[PDB]
From a paper:
Here we describe a new mechanism by which foot-and-mouth disease virus (FMDV) can become resistant to ribavirin. Amino acid changes in the viral polymerase, selected by ribavirin, are able to modify the types of mutations produced in the presence of ribavirin. P44S but not P169S was detected in a 70% proportion in R-Ap35, as evidenced by analysis of both the consensus sequences and their corresponding mutant spectra. These results suggest that the three substitutions in 3D were selected sequentially during replication in the presence of increasing concentrations of R: first M296I, then P44S and finally P169S. To identify possible structural modifications of the viral polymerase associated with the important alterations of the mutational spectrum in progeny RNA, and to investigate how these modifications can affect RNA binding and polymerase activity, the different mutant 3Ds were incubated with the heteropolymeric sym/sub-U RNA of sequence 5′GCAUGGGCCC3′, crystallized, and analyzed by X-ray diffraction.
Two different crystal forms were obtained; the single mutants 3D(P44S) and 3D(P169S) incubated with sym/sub-U RNA crystallized in the tetragonal P42212 space group. The RNA molecule appeared mostly disordered in the two structures. The X-ray structures were determined to 2.2 Å and 2.6 Å resolution for 3D(P44S) and 3D(P169S), respectively, and to 2.6 Å and 2.5 Å for 3D(P44S, M296I) and 3D(SSI), respectively. P44 is conserved among known picornaviral polymerases, and it lies in a loop that connects strand β2 and helix α2 in the fingers domain. Thus, substitutions at the conserved amino acid P44 might disturb both the shape and interactions of the template channel, and the interactions with the incoming rNTP that are mediated by residues of motif F. Interestingly, the amino acid residues from M16 to K18, at the N-terminus of the enzyme, appear totally re-organized. The rearrangements in M16-K18 were also observed in the uncomplexed 3D(P44S), but with a weak electron density and higher temperature factors than the average, reflecting some degree of flexibility of this region in the absence of RNA. Thus, the structural results point at P44S as the key substitution related to reorientation of template residues that might be associated with altered RMP recognition and incorporation. The comparison of activity values in vitro suggests that amino acid P44S inflicted a cost upon 3D function. 3D(P44S) displayed undetectable incorporation of RMP opposite C in the template (<0.5% of elongated sym/sub-AC), and only a modest incorporation opposite U (5±1% of elongated sym/sub-AU).
Residue numbers in the entry: 1 to 476
């Protein structure tokens, strides 16, 4: 987005310095070109002259203003996608109760009891457990009061900037490209869930190419569903954005919120309002208060959904701005936030769509190098989605989500202290699709030190998960 104002204030907002990630026994074996991101300016493995503060906020270069003709086209595309979206999901989008927003419903997980409250509760030394009761699903005196200000549409807030403690490629570690988590006030998260949580639960349950959303999918079981769908198209594209959510211009965001979250689709009028508060935001980093116009904060309860919705509208927009007579059935797509796979039987020229995406402030490049740009004739077994390839399991004839071995090596190389055994069981479920030989090699350093699930047990778990009938018929 656009940094419009930078102010220095009395209160200092401390950020999480020093990593919680420590190397494992696997690190010495795989030696990954990876490591924990820089969390302080004094971290010795940074490049010289790199000021972490200017780099973590360098992603704000934009807020691209759209022309009147482009804005009207964006509205038609947002209306057309919303029309499809609410045709599949339905119009049961009434506000969640305070109780249901905290405890969750079917398709929507419960709110995290101790994960940071936001501002100004962090300055006041209050944790989430003090402001809200999470077992009984009730609210304290201040959250209750903040909800009133939101109903009246006068509520204001600040986003708390957190440095994301995560494994990053060493090249990005040295460059100081630490990602940030924009922590929003817990009451704002509560209210957003109240306003659109019902909608969110319905998208999770109805995930798939029809609504263009993979949010809430289970890759183990769903890769067969997604794989078989995209396999019947002549052309498949793996499209990468550079800084997707940072570059959502305010014009795109505003029109989207207006078209998708209308009262005529069963929404409370404040659904549009609360979402619109994400457009122009104030961010608190140490002593600095940075006002940003445009872009999406990662702290909102529905960031993945919003990004996914925008991703769908963007593709419809860029195709309509280039070709004539483009409709929703001209192509098919699946997205999870910025991650995207597009397919069509038409020989669509994705290379010429570049300046049409640029009009939204977004930069599209092919995932597979700069192969003289975008090319035709690629299939779903050539693309990547959610860091997983589409490979055929020769024993069942089902598509399986296969992660690159280098990524699995990197994931197994670091862990938070005391979580290593739990992490191994989790990663084993990801690594089983790499085959028995590769699965064995990845977990060799942990042998004797931790329980490692047998390849066999995880394969048999997968077969039943993807198709119960197939596992049942196996015992013919
Ligand atoms: Mg939460
Ligand atoms: Mg947190």
């Amino acid at each position: 987005g656009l940094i419009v104002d930078t102010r220095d204030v009395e209160e200092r907002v401390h950020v999480m310095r020093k990593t919680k990630l420590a190397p494992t026994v696997a690190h010495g074996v795989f030696n990954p070109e990876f490591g924990p991101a820089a969390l302080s300016n004094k971290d010795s493995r940074l490049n010289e002259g790199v000021v972490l503060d200017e780099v973590i906020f360098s992603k704000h270069k934009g807020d691209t203003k759209m022309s009147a003709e482009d804005k009207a086209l964006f509205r038609r595309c947002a209306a057309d996608y919303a029309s499809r979206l609410h045709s599949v999901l339905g119009t049961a989008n009434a506000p969640l109760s305070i109780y249901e927003a905290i405890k969750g419903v079917d398709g929507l997980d419960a709110m995290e009891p101790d994960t940071a409250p936001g501002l100004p509760w962090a300055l006041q030394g209050k944790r989430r457990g003090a402001l809200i009761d999470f077992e009984n699903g009730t609210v304290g005196p201040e959250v209750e009061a903040a909800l009133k200000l939101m109903e009246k549409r006068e509520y204001k807030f600040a986003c708390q900037t957190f440095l994301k403690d995560e494994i990053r490629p060493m090249e990005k570690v040295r460059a100081g490209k630490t990602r940030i988590v924009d922590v929003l006030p817990v009451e704002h998260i509560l209210y957003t869930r109240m306003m659109i949580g019902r909608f969110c639960a319905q998208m999770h349950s109805n995930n798939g190419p029809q609504i263009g959303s993979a949010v809430g999918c289970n890759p183990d079981v769903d890769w067969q569903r997604f794989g078989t769908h995209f396999a019947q198209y002549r052309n498949v594209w793996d499209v990468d954005y550079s800084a997707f959510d940072a570059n959502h211009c305010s014009d795109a965001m505003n029109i989207m919120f207006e078209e998708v979250f209308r009262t005529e689709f069963g929404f409370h009028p404040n659904a549009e309002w609360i979402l619109k508060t994400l457009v122009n935001t104030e961010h608190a980093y140490e002593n600095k208060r940075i006002t940003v116009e445009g872009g999406m904060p990662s702290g909102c309860s529905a960031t993945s959904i919003i990004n996914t919705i925008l991703n769908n509208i963007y593709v419809l927009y860029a195709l309509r701005r280039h070709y004539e007579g483009v409709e929703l059935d001209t192509y098919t797509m699946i997205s999870y936030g910025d991650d995207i796979v597009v397919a069509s039987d038409y020989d669509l020229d994705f290379e010429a769509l570049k300046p049409h995406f640029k009009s939204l402030g977004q930069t599209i490049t092919p995932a597979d190098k700069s192969d003289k740009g975008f090319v035709l004739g690629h299939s779903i077994t050539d693309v990547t989605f959610l860091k997983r390839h589409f490979h055929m399991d020769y024993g069942t004839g089902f598509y399986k989500p296969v992660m690159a071995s280098k990524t699995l090596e990197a994931i197994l190389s670091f862990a938070r202290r005391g979580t290593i055994q739990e992490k191994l069981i989790s990663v084993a479920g990801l690594a089983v699709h790499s085959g028995p030989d590769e699965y064995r090699r990845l977990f060799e350093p942990f042998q004797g030190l931790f329980e490692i699930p047998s390849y066999r047990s995880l394969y048999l778990r997968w077969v039943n998960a993807v198709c119960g009938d197939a596992a049942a018929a196996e015992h013919h």
